[PDB]
Amino acid sequence: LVHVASVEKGRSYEDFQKVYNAIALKLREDDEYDNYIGYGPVLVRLAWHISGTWDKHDNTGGSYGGTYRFKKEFNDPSNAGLQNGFKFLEPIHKEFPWISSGDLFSLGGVTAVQEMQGPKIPWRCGRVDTPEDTTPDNGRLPDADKDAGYVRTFFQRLNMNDREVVALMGAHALGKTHLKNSGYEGGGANNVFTNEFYLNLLNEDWKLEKNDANNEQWDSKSGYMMLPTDYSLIQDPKYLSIVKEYANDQDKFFKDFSKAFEKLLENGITFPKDAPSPFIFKTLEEQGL
Numbered sequence: 001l002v003h004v005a006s007v008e009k010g011r012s013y014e015d016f017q018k019v020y021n022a023i024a025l026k027l028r029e030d031d032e033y034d035n036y037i038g039y040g041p042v043l044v045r046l047a048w049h050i051s052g053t054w055d056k057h058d059n060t061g062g063s064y065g066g067t068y069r070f071k072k073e074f075n076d077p078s079n080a081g082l083q084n085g086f087k088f089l090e091p092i093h094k095e096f097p098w099i100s101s102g103d104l105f106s107l108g109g110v111t112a113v114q115e116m117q118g119p120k121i122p123w124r125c126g127r128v129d130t131p132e133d134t135t136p137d138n139g140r141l142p143d144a145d146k147d148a149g150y151v152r153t154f155f156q157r158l159n160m161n162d163r164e165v166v167a168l169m170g171a172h173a174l175g176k177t178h179l180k181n182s183g184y185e186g187g188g189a190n191n192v193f194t195n196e197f198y199l200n201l202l203n204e205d206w207k208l209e210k211n212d213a214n215n216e217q218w219d220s221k222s223g224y225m226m227l228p229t230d231y232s233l234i235q236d237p238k239y240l241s242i243v244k245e246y247a248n249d250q251d252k253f254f255k256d257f258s259k260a261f262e263k264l265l266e267n268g269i270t271f272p273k274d275a276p277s278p279f280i281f282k283t284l285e286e287q288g289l
């Protein structure tokens with residue numbers, strides 16, 4: 001099972017930069033969402049969830065086919081709340097209907113990270129919408145009530161190693177959990193991409209508590225939370241070392257996250273030898289827009 005990247009006919013960097021800019025301008029405009037967090041974090045969650053269905057063993061799932069647009073995946077309990085991201089992207093897709101769904105969903109995550117002052121994430125076009133019967137079944141995204149061993153094993157399916165896992169989890173500096181979506185509450189309201197996730201893990205006074213949905217979570221005196229899978233990153237000695245590294249090296253974190261996140265978004269895609277090089281989009285700020 002091979003998914004070959006196919007550039008939307010006639011499109012080049014500038015076409016995609018326009019799509020990036022439209023997302024970025026809407027991000028700036030729609031600032032009220034989720035108690036003024038805005039849509040950046042949910043767009044990053046969306047890009048991860050459309051990608052995180054991938055299975056290296058048979059190359060099913062992944063971002064390529066845009067299958068989040070179909071009911072089965074759209075309604076996955078693991079995707080609760082992502083409908084807000086889909087609705088945000090809908091007018092963008094109406095403006096640029098030439099773009100494939102997988103390209104749009106993944107680009108929305110890239111744009112969100114960058115516009116939230118994160119690292120540049122190189123991005124490649126050419127995901128092709130596939131039919132409804134290619135939609136992966138629910139249950140491929142990870143549980144949050146698990147330990148480090150679960151995390152490590154889960155991410156092997158996505159071909160991610162320890163460093164890649166710890167780096168990817170840094171995205172949890174963004175946004176928050178919502179009890180109605182996932183059965184967890186809290187996380188603050190941060191919408192700037194930093195290494196704060198790791199600093200919070202190492203520096204806060206955490207206490208394990210059972211929330212109003214009957215799930216365990218770690219809560220700090222200062223009002224932050226960690227999922228058990230987040231906290232596992234300081235319980236396992238291998239993960240802890242990497243957590244310390246990123247807490248003490250912002251640039252290293254940025255660079256590792258960028259590589260892991262592009263890899264996450266490209267898992268399952270075969271890029272032909274004469275495919276365009278990855279695009280590095282300018283932010284609105286860099287454009288003076």
Ligand code: HEM
Binds near residue numbers: 081177
């Ligand atoms: C063990 C792996 C992971 C687990 C169990 C997990 C679990 C969760 C849960 C339960 C939420 C809260 C959803 C809600 O209540 O609205 C969440 C939110 C979020 N996740 Fe993860 N996640 C994982 C990995 C990742 C990765 C790899 C990324 C991206 C690189 C990511 C990015 C996000 C973002 C940005 C949010 C905030 C969304 C918002 O504010 O609406 N997560 N995650």
Ligand SMILES: Nc1c(Br)cnc2ccccc12
Binds near residue numbers: 175
């Ligand atoms: N802000 C977060 C922190 Br801090 C820790 N874990 C999270 C998991 C999901 C969403 C947000 C967070």
